[PDB]
Design a protein around this ligand. Structure first.
Ligand code: A1JE1
Length: 339
């Protein structure tokens, strides 16, 4: 399809230019006012901030350099920043500024006020198949783009997908993404979404992102993921068996797609065969999908989140508010020279 070949050829040209010449130190902390904590992890936090000169709102990710080294995430945090300053796609969150100081690394992204897809899924119960299909088509197009750049994403799940002001998806949380020619080996991701070859400590490739799409479409349509248990070891046993049971309300076309995405043998899995992503785009479950209209954002979305303005935080949840302290001395300077 010529218009798709030329689109992706140009996409890769523009990605490589920025990849080979990354930007650095494009703002500083006292250019912003702090508003609220939006999310936390074992080495970082995300805060809503407002730029003092322009008044624009942003999601500022703050990573603690000393905890990054301890949790062994140095290369991952350098992957994340380099990838985010080089990509450009309608359904990816854009990096606007980055900088560092004596204690922390900072990535400043556009703020999306609609909240995480996870919150909306749990409030509604499950998404109808047309509603799940609209979100899934945006993930297929985003993976077609990323994989053509030799990037793997490695953390697809509903908590990492935001719903925007037009009801469309924005993928965020690029902390495990990596540029990969061939195979890679790091153990990372979230237990319920891991493909069997990751659990078995094998060299793996972009097929793990297509497995995770199968898990996501099942979770959107059922209300719960296909493999669950109280301990990760029990989750892993179910995954590598891959025996999966489908609710009776699933359509026959949906069950067929999911059996081909949740294929335990990676050499048989849709998205990893000779025809690549087109085995997915041409599947009967997507027969009603206008792929061009979705990319151009001309389709009316299933619902628009309720929010009052660009600074509204009502769709995110409440976290303890702690300080952003910067040490008087520099920490881990050498390890993050390239950030
Ligand atoms: N070639 C072998 C593969 O494991 C399968 N193929 C994967 C590539 O695409 C189509 C089918 C199928 O099962 C046995 C044989 O044919």
């Amino acid at each position: 399809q010529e218009s798709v070949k030329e689109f992706l050829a140009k996409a890769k040209e523009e990605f490589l230019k920025k990849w080979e010449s990354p930007s650095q130190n494009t703002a500083q902390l006292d250019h912003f006012d702090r508003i609220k904590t939006l999310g936390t992890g074992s080495f970082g936090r995300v805060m809503l901030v407002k730029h003092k000169e322009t008044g624009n709102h942003y999601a500022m990710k703050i990573l603690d350099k000393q905890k990054v080294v301890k949790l062994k995430q140095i290369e991952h945090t350098l992957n994340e920043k380099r990838i985010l300053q080089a990509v450009n796609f309608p359904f990816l969150v854009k990096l606007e500024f980055s900088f560092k100081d004596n204690s922390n690394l900072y990535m400043v992204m556009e703020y999306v006020p609609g909240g995480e897809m996870f919150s909306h899924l749990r409030r509604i119960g499950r998404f109808s198949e047309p509603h799940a299909r609209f979100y899934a088509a945006q993930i297929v197009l985003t993976f077609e783009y990323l994989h053509s750049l030799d990037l793997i994403y490695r953390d697809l799940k509903p908590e990492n997908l935001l719903i925007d002001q037009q009801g469309y998806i924005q993928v965020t949380d690029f902390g495990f993404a990596k540029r990969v020619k061939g195979r890679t080996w790091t153990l990372c991701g979230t237990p319920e979404y891991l493909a069997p070859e990751i659990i078995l400590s094998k060299g793996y490739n972009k097929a793990v992102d297509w497995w995770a799409l199968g898990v996501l479409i099942y979770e959107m349509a059922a209300g719960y993921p296909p493999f669950f248990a109280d301990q990760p070891i029990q989750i892993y046993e179910k995954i590598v068996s891959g025996k999966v049971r489908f609710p009776s309300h699933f359509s026959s076309d949906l069950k067929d797609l999911l059996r081909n995405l949740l294929q335990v043998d990676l050499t048989k899995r849709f998205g990893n065969l000779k025809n690549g992503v087109n085995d997915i785009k041409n599947h009967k479950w997507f027969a009603t999908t206008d792929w061009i209209a979705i990319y151009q954002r001309k389709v009316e979305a299933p619902f628009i989140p309720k929010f009052k303005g660009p600074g509204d935080t009502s769709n995110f949840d409440d976290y303890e508010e702690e300080e952003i302290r910067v040490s008087i001395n520099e920490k881990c300077g050498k390890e993050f020279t390239e950030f």
